[PDB]
């Protein structure tokens, strides 16, 4: 059973191997042009609804009307799919937010943001387990005389940093889960000094993506940019991502949506402009499991 193979050589002969043990774990580590501009691993680079082979975007009775599409991205090059081997899952439009010359950014979590959306939300709380992918459609228009740029980031397991410097990992379930409402980024860290009666919530610094890493590198995550000059909307198609095939939607949030001003909003000459950002999100290829009496969370 001796295994002979080519040695790791320079560029101007081989070695032999025998496995002594029954468990593979015991085994030694087995070590494995024209156009430079081309990506080695495209999918890791944020492809388009176009770029993997896949306008009126429609789910159930809900439907987006979109010319914008080169502005879309399929996370990790992977399209949503059923746990293999429903019109509760449709497009829900969340409460519109306002972008101003001084906004630092906004965040949301999935499924959390959708927890009260019609039959979807119901299905979520009546079952132990649930899984779902998403289509995130960020809407934000302005004039040809306005300027600015939004960075729309979809982060897997988006754990955010807390307000305390005396204790760690202590943000309350209530605070961690804002629902549709949102949750927002800040320009500076402000430690919750109230010892006795703790705020127990996140303190997300913008240039650190609220998680201890530099915002400039947030682009290694599935993302899209809204440049007011060229486009008014972004569409992110998100797959179910997890260390499990299915999980508790109530205990665990799979994806995080982060929206930050890469370039600040500016208009004509007004000292203080504003424009709306509307998020319409739809759950995809979704399925639930382990039906029983309804979960009634202490959200407060």
């Amino acid at each position: 059973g001796a295994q002979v193979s080519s040695q790791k050589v320079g560029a101007h002969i081989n070695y032999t191997t025998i496995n002594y043990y029954r468990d593979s774990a015991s085994n030694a580590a087995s070590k494995q042009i024209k156009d430079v501009l081309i990506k080695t691993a495209p999918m890791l680079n944020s492809p388009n609804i176009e770029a993997c082979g896949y306008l009126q975007l429609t789910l159930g009775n809900s439907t987006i009307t979109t010319q914008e599409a080169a502005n879309s991205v399929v996370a990790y090059g992977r399209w949503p799919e059923y746990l293999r081997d429903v019109a509760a899952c449709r497009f829900y439009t969340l409460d519109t937010v306002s972008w101003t010359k001084e906004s630092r950014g906004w965040w949301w979590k999935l499924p959390d943001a959708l927890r009260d959306m019609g039959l979807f939300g119901q299905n979520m709380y009546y079952h132990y387990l649930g899984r779902s992918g998403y289509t995130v459609h960020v809407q934000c228009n302005a004039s040809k005389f306005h300027q600015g740029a939004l960075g729309v980031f979809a982060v897997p397991e988006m754990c955010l940093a807390g307000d305390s410097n005396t204790t760690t990992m202590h943000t309350s379930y209530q605070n961690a889960n804002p629902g549709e409402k949102g949750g927002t980024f800040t320009g500076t860290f402000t430690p919750d000094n109230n010892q006795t009666s703790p705020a127990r919530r996140f303190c997300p610094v913008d240039y650190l993506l609220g998680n201890g890493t530099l915002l400039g590198n947030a682009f290694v995550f599935p993302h899209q940019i809204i440049n007011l000059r060229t486009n008014n909307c972004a569409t992110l198609v998100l797959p179910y991502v997890n260390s499990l095939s299915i999980d508790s939607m109530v205990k665990h949030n799979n994806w995080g949506i982060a929206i930050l001003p890469l370039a600040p909003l500016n208009f004509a000459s007004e000292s203080s402009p504003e424009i709306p950002i509307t998020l319409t999100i739809a759950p995809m290829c979704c399925e639930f499991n382990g039906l029983r009496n309804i979960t009634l969370p202490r959200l407060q």
């Binding site: 009775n61 809900s62 009307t65 979109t66 010319q67 439009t93 019609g118 228009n141 004039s143 008014n232």
Partner: protein, 60 residues
């Protein structure tokens, strides 16, 4: 949309089948059959209200 070329915007057109409170807010209109219209991109917008009825025919 008969406004100017420099004008931009997004509108939501909605249809709600009968049986509940008539929609007074986007939040509830959102929940039924709907279309999102981008004014800036195209000047006009069509929405089909599909036949959905309990009875075979409705009265005039």
């Amino acid at each position: 949309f008969c406004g100017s070329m420099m004008a931009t915007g997004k509108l939501l057109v909605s249809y709600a089948p009968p049986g509940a409170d008539p929609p007074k807010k986007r939040k509830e209109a959102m929940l039924g059959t709907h279309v999102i219209w981008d004014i800036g991109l195209q000047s006009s917008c069509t929405m089909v209200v599909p036949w959905i009825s309990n009875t075979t025919y409705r009265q005039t």
